[PDB]
Amino acid sequence: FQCGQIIGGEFTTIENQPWFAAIYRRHRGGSVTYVCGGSLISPCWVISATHCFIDYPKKEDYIVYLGRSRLNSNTQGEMKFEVENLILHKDYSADTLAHHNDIALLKIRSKEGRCAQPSRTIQTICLPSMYNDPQFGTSCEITGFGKENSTDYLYPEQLKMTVVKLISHRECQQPHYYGSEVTTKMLCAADPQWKTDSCQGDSGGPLVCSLQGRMTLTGIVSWGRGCALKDKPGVYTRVSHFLPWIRSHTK
Numbered sequence: 235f236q237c238g239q240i241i242g243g244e245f246t247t248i249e250n251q252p253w254f255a256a257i258y259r260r261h262r263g264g265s266v267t268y269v270c271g272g273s274l275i276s277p278c279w280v281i282s283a284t285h286c287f288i289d290y291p292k293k294e295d296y297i298v299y300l301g302r303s304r305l306n307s308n309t310q311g312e313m314k315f316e317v318e319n320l321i322l323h324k325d326y327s328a329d330t331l332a333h334h335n336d337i338a339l340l341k342i343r344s345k346e347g348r349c350a351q352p353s354r355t356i357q358t359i360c361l362p363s364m365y366n367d368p369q370f371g372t373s374c375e376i377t378g379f380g381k382e383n384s385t386d387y388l389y390p391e392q393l394k395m396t397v398v399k400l401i402s403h404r405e406c407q408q409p410h411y412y413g414s415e416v417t418t419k420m421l422c423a424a425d426p427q428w429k430t431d432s433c434q435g436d437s438g439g440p441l442v443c444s445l446q447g448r449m450t451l452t453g454i455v456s457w458g459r460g461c462a463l464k465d466k467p468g469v470y471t472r473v474s475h476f477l478p479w480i481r482s483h484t485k
C-alpha cells in the first residue's frame with residue numbers, strides 16, 4: 235500500500251476512489267441497507283462519521299465493502315468485512331444544526347481473519363499532517379452513493395463523484411451561510427455556482443484533496459442544510475485537527 239496514489243458530478247468505478255468504503259447495516263429483520271461512506275486509512279482501519287452509527291452503535295450489525303462501485307450488486311475484486319471494533323467520538327454532538335466531532339473509526343476483519351489488501355480497486359487514502367490543509371479555493375473531490383437530487387426517493391445504483399471547492403471559515407461563518415455553527419474543527423466546501431454537492435447518503439464519505447502529489451483525506455462528509463442550496467455548503471470533519479484522536483485509537 236502507497237496511500238493516495240451526489241448532486242451533479244458523474245458516475246465512476248472504484249478504481250478512481252480505491253480508498254472508498256461502502257458501509258451497510260444488517261438491521262433486526264435480516265435485510266441489509268446502505269448506511270454511509272468511509273475511507274480506508276490503513277489495512278485494518280476505515281474512517282467515517284459518528285452520526286452514521288449514533289442510532290445503532292452495535293458493531294456486530296455492520297458490513298463494510300472495499301472495491302465496490304455498485305450499490306446492490308457485486309463488482310469483480312470487491313472485499314467484504316466485519317466491524318471488529320466501532321469507535322465513535324465520545325465528544326460527538328448534534329444538538330443544533332452542526333454535528334461536532336463527527337468522526338468514527340471502524341476496525342475491519344474479513345471472515346478469513348484478514349485486513350484490507352492492496353489491489354487496483356483497494357488502496358489507502360493519505361491522512362493529512364497536523365493542521366496542513368489545502369488553500370481556500372482548492373478543488374477537492376467528493377464520492378458516494380448518496381441521492382442525485384434531494385427530492386429523490388431512491389439512491390443511484392452506481393458510485394458517483396464530483397469536484398467542490400474549499401471555502402474559508404470567514405465566508406462559511408457568515409450569517410446568511412452557517413454563522414457560528416461552523417467551528418475551526420470543520421471545513422466548508424461547495425460548487426461556486428451551487429450546482430454540485432454531497433447529499434443524503436454521502437455522509438461519512440471523503441473530501442479528497444491533492445497536496446504534495448498525495449490524495450489526502452482532508453474532510454469527512456458531515457452535515458449541511460439541504461443539498462446544492464445557494465449559500466448552504468457541505469460541511470466536513472477537518473481531519474488535520476483529529477490526528478491525536480485517530481492515533482490514540484490506532485495504536
Ligand SMILES: NC[C@H]1CC[C@@H](C(=O)O)CC1
Pocket residue numbers: 431432433434435436437455456457458459460461462467468469
Ligand atoms: N451537503 C453535505 C450534507 C452531508 C449529509 C447531509 C445529511 O445526511 O443530511 C445532507 C448534505
